[PDB]
RNA sequence: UAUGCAAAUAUAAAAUUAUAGUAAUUAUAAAUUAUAUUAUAUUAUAUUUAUUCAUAUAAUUAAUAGGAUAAUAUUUGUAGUUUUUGAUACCAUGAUAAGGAUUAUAAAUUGAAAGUGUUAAUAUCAUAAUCAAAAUUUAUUAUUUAUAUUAAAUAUGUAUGUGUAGAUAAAAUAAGAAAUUAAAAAGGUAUUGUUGCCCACCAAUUUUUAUAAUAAAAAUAACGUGCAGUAAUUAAUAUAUUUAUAAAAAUAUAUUUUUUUUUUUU
């Protein structure tokens, strides 16, 4: 147990300084929040990939045939609709009842951070390439 | 060791030392204790009782008969525990007409003493002629044998009390033992008015003759309010009823005297609106009483005070 | 402790890097509160409803002759930014000014506002050590 | 050569008892003789100590709002302070007033024995807040100031034992004081029993009892503060009669005896 | 022998049997229990006067 | 490496030093000082799994006072300033931690005394203490690694990079591991003992004399260089020759006041 020793004085000037460097460091936060907003949105209208898993079934049957035709025929203007968002997807598969009880237990879905990439992307590569200025939480393409 | 001390009810190495009683040996009860039975203290409280009458009783005996006809004027007079706000004219008015009509000395005078405490509680002047009208030809006139009820004389002796006036001596005078002997049939409230009347004319011979009167008739002194007996020894300015208060002033008890001193202190003091008129100062008297207080209390030691000044001599 | 940071330097031990229980460390010191979220931005170290009152820090509670700073979890209001008055937060090394009002900032605490653990790093208040561990870390240029 | 906390103090009692009470020498505490409490201090002084001794929300402390220098110094930077007037524009002011300070008589068990809602804690006996006289409770006038020092101040001079008093209080204490403080005896052997601000209410539970409500003017009992007069009870038994309760009569009575100094006595 | 434990009794359990003692102490003797003012460096700090 | 020259320990002596006047002694050997591959007195270390480690703030510690069903106390509302100074931000003794190395299996514990902030006699700079919402530099800390991911006190935005440098951590206990090793021989100029002692040169001075770079010898407590010696960082001791800031060092002989390692024809 060491007497603590003292500490040093402040600084001089550094009050301006440092309500200066919060001040504009807020004012850039605006447009950090502003961009990261328009971001999000454009996310959560754009469309996305697959998000289901074609090397399990009931998805790798051809896609002339079961699952894909349930999906062509009755469900297509749905999952346009939200853009197949793996959270509205599954849940449209829920509720379409004719596949009832697999959705959860024999199917099987990409994982979160792939099922979230741009429709038509090609190479894995496109995790990492998606901006880094903006806050979305991985929610941005 | 440390400057905490140990608390020895729940530090086993004092409860299970060799001094005490350790864990193994069987935990009956050492010894009985009979406190309570052997010495007995009776109680006192620090605060003064809550439902006691605190005025004067003036013990209403009244027939059954009259006391049902006489009610509507009766009504406008105090009962138990109750003091109608009815202007003290019309009720000695009331008396003064309807009283003739009914034939009972009791009635009539037990009405009258229900007139005067009535008054008594307005303090309004003129009510004693009711006495020297009525009553003074029968009972305090030219050595009259009849002997007056006590509600009568303690109504009328009140009505002296809290209206200032000189009357009271006559009546007072008349109760001892060779005359109607009512002195030991007063309350305490009773002797504490009149000590404070009394204290307030300022006669120091009405208070050495009550006084004297109350230590013989075996009154409760030291319930005898503080208030009472500070104002009536307050009044004391001669020589010899001086003496006569300080051998006197032993005969309350040790808290008595304590707020006695404090009483006194506190009405020349800060509370000296507390009462209606003033005191007025003695200086000698007040003196004396905190004096008295010091005495009969017990000595604290403090040895830097006393011997402050002292200094060793090797003579 | 080791520096004297303020009075309580010498009443607490660190005891090295130790665990307390779950949510619970003796001196609150909010180094997330600014913590930037898009999608969460409403959800995210503010208030569980938005159905609940503004907290007491929004209003007057009595006579006052004045105040110098309002207490950081005061919502900024449209007010703030309109009525043209000084909004001062205590903050570190003294007080931080809302000065230059904007709408992006309303409904947000001004606990949200303030960054609480600044980049610009004063070398004034650094002992040489200090200033040399800094430099291992990547942080005071040397 | 000298270095004392306050320059100059004052005495407990005044001239008519000091001038001839010096002549009787007290005893003073044996190791230490020269007391200088709290109740000796000047007006300044005690003003400053009751403010200090408060936390956050205590006068004392500059950024509570009840402070009145007009600038404070956070490390070498000074800081100008915001007036009140100015403080109102963004933050919106609702100031009730001293009532809302102020709970009725009738939440104080749930309040485990307080009207006050004040930042120090307010005893309703006299010896606790007692400064040189004894302490009373305006329950008009309960201020964040607090003039008359009633309140138990945590960190003031001479405060620990008053503290430690606090601790020792008996179960009934707040209550017990504050009903026996007020509503006493009178003087003249009359009952406390008439107060103008509580008469209606007595009128209503006897019109209440009379229509042969029970319930209803039992409800309104409860939230009398002051002894009821004799009428009151008189109109409760009577309307117990017809029903034949028997048990509610009897508790009612009981109610009124010993408790209440006999008001139900008749 | 050592103490185990101590507790405070009365004494007419175990006093002195009459017929050993001196007759009436109460009447015949003043006794005093009392301190020696002197530092005593063995034996007991109260004797009888 | 014995043809010149060259007596010289093998003991004939009377307290140490000293050219035979200097200081008052000196010399000495067995007590004491933890690691040098011994037989299994009766059974095993060579396995497993790990390593990105951060968090403190907005000053007054000094005393007692009782209430309903109690035989009566306004004691309702109990009012006498001022002569002392340490636990403080500050010097101000004590006392409990952590730390595996040979008392074993049966009816049985794999956690120790040698002291880790708060504690009891040294006083003579100062109010520094949480009752919320707060500022990273501190050796001494096991975090969630790819199907689905923010709702109640406010709760962490950053580091995808071939399970990848150096160097490190833990365990033989209701778990699952099996054969390589370890006990016995040792010295002290110190004397509660290596943080022990000593050695020479290098200044002043003091004192005797047989005056050789710069006399010699003896007392001596500075300064500065080292580190010579105590089997002591290439063991020491004696003679011999050489060498030289200073202890001393190189070589040639003898030698243990140095510690030992041992084939009765293979
Ligand atoms: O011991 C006490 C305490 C308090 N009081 C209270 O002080 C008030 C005035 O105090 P005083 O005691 O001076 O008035 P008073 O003698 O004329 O009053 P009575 O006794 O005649 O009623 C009184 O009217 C009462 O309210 C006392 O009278 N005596
Ligand atoms: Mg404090
Ligand atoms: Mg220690
Ligand atoms: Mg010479
Ligand atoms: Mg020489
Ligand atoms: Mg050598
Ligand atoms: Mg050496
Ligand atoms: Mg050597
Ligand atoms: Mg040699
Ligand atoms: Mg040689
Ligand atoms: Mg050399
Ligand atoms: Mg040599």
């Given at each position: 147990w060491a007497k603590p020793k003292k500490r040093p004085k402040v600084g001089q000037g550094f009050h301006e300084k440092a309500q200066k460097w919060r001040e504009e460091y807020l004012l850039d936060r605006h447009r950090a929040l502003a961009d990261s907003l328009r971001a999000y949105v454009e996310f959560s209208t754009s469309k996305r990939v697959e998000?289901?898993?074609?090397?399990?079934k009931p998805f790798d049957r051809i896609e002339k045939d079961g699952v894909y035709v349930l999906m062509r025929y009755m469900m297509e203007e749905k999952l346009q609709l939200c853009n197949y968002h793996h959270r509205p997807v599954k849940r449209l598969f829920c509720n379409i009842g004719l596949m009832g009880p697999q959705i959860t237990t024999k199917a099987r879905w990409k994982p979160y951070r792939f099922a979230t990439n741009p429709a038509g992307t090609s190479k894995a590569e496109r995790m990492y390439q998606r901006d880094k200025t903006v806050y979305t939480h991985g929610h941005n393409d | 060791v440390g400057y905490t001390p140990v608390n020895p009810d729940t530090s086993p190495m004092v409860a299970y030392s060799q001094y005490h009683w350790h864990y193994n040996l069987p935990q009956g009860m050492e010894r009985p204790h009979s406190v309570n039975r052997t010495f007995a203290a009776p109680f006192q409280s620090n605060h003064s009782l809550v439902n006691k009458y605190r005025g004067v009783w003036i013990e209403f005996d009244m027939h059954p008969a009259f006391s049902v006809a006489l009610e509507p004027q009766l009504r406008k007079l105090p009962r138990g525990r109750t003091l109608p706000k009815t202007p003290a004219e019309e009720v000695i008015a009331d008396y003064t007409a309807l009283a003739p009509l009914v034939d009972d000395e009791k009635t009539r005078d037990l009405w009258l003493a229900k007139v005067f405490q009535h008054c008594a509680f307005q303090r309004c002047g003129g009510a004693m002629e009711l006495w020297e009208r009525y009553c003074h030809q029968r009972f305090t006139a030219e050595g009259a044998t009849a002997k007056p009820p006590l509600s009568l004389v303690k109504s009328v002796l009140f009505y002296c009390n809290k209206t200032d006036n000189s009357g009271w001596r006559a009546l007072f005078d008349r109760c001892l033992k060779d005359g109607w002997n009512y002195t030991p049939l007063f309350d305490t409230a009773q002797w504490s008015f009149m000590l404070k009347s009394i204290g307030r004319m300022g006669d120091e011979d009405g208070v050495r003759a009550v006084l004297e009167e109350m230590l013989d008739v075996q009154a409760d002194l030291d319930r005898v309010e503080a208030r009472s007996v500070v104002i009536a020894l307050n009044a004391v300015t001669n020589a010899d009823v001086y003496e006569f208060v300080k051998k006197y002033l032993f005969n309350f008890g040790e808290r008595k005297v304590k707020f006695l001193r404090t009483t006194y202190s506190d009405l020349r003091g800060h509370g000296a609106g507390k009462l209606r008129i003033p005191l007025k100062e003695n200086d000698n008297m007040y003196y004396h009483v905190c004096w008295h207080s010091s005495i009969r209390s017990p000595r604290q030691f403090s040895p830097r005070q006393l011997y402050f000044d002292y200094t060793p001599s090797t003579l | 402790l080791k520096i004297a940071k303020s009075a309580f330097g010498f009443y607490l031990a660190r005891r090295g890097q130790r665990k307390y229980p779950f949510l619970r460390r003796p001196h609150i010191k909010?180094?997330?509160?600014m913590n930037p979220s898009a999608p969460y931005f409403w959800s995210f170290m503010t208030a569980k409803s938005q159905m609940a009152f503004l907290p007491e820090e929004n209003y007057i509670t009595g006579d006052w002759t004045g105040k110098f700073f309002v207490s950081k979890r005061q919502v900024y209001t449209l007010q703030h930014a309109t009525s043209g008055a000084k909004v001062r937060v205590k903050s570190f090394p003294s007080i931080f000014e809302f000065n230059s009002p904007s709408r992006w900032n309303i409904g947000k605490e001004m606990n949200t506002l303030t960054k609480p653990r600044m980049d610009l790093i004063d070398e004034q208040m650094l002992t040489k050590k200090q200033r040399l561990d800094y430099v291992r870390a990547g942080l005071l240029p040397k | 050569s000298v270095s004392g906390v306050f320059s100059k103090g004052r005495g407990i009692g005044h001239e008519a008892t000091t001038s001839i009470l010096r002549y009787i020498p007290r005893a003073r505490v044996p190791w230490q003789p020269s007391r200088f409490g709290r109740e000796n201090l000047t007006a300044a002084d005690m003003a400053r100590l009751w403010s200090r001794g408060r936390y956050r929300d205590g006068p004392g402390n500059y950024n509570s709002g009840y402070c009145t220098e007009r600038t404070h110094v956070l490390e070498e930077n000074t800081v100008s302070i915001i007036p009140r007037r100015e403080l109102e524009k963004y933050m919106p002011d609702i100031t009730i007033g001293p009532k809302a300070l102020v709970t009725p008589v009738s939440l104080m068990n749930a309040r485990n024995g307080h009207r006050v809602t004040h930042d120090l804690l307010h005893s309703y006996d006299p010896h606790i807040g007692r400064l040189g006289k004894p302490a009373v409770v305006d329950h008009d006038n309960i201020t964040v100031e607090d003039p008359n020092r009633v309140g138990l101040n945590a960190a003031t001079l001479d405060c620990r034992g008053r503290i430690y008093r606090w601790l020792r209080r008996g179960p009934f204490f707040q209550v017990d004081n504050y009903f026996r403080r007020s509503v006493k005896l009178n003087r003249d052997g009359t009952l406390p029993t008439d107060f103008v601000h509580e008469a209606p209410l007595m009128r209503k539970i006897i019109r209440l009892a009379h229509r042969g409500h029970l319930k209803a003017a039992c409800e309104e009992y409860r939230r009398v503060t002051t002894v009821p007069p004799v009428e009151v009870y008189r109109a409760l038994t009577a309307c117990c009669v017809p029903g034949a309760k028997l048990a509610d009569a009897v508790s009612i009575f009981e109610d009124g005896d010993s408790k209440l100094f006999y008001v139900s006595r008749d | 022998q050592g103490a185990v434990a101590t507790a405070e009794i009365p004494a007419f359990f175990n006093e002195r049997p009459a017929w050993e003692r001196p007759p009436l102490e109460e009447t015949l003797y003043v006794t005093t229990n009392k301190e020696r003012y002197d530092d005593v460096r063995g034996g007991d700090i109260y004797y009888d006067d």
């Open positions: 998000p289901w898993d074609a090397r399990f | - | 909010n180094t997330h509160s | - | -």
